[PDB]
Amino acid sequence: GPGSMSCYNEITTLLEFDSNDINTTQRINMVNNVTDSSFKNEVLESDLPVMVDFWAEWCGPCKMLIPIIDEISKELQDKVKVLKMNIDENPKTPSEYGIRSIPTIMLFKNGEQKDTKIGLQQKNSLLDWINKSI
Incomplete structure (x- = not known):
């Protein structure tokens, strides 16, 4: 039958x-x-x-916690250092610290672990929680 011929072309990238x-x-x-x-x-x-929040954009309510942390961070800045860690950027992190779920809030003090809390927390919740741990 007909010779099905098709020569492929290429463009410089x-x-x-x-x-x-x-x-x-x-x-x-x-x-x-x-x-x-x-x-x-x-x-x-x-x-x-x-306070380290281990996060990911596939959570959903991240859009809320960003403003929440935005405001709260400066409130805590003197006492508690607000820091973020994306599980996408650091794939070893959720394995090491057994992060099954997000946001997620983890408390450190002199590098030592104090307490952990998973889920979405509001300004008052964040402050209240970390002040219990520190």
Whole structure:
């Protein structure tokens, strides 16, 4: 029958952006995400209590807790350091600390674990809880 012939074509692929990476000793004294190395390095070196929220965008109510933490972080900044850890960025994290579920709130103090709480918590709940643990 008819020779089913089809020669495939190709187009040159180009790059968008360049490569760049920098790092300096700046204080992590602000609500942000930390990476696994920096997590231990900074958190386990913080004498003052640190609240770490292990999160992911596939939760749902993240959109709420971001403003909640946005406001509360500055309230706690003096006493308790609000820090975030995405389970996408640090896949070893939820295995190490047995994070089955999200948000999720985990309390540290001098790098030592105080208490843990899973689920969505509001401003008053967060404050109330961490003040019980510290």
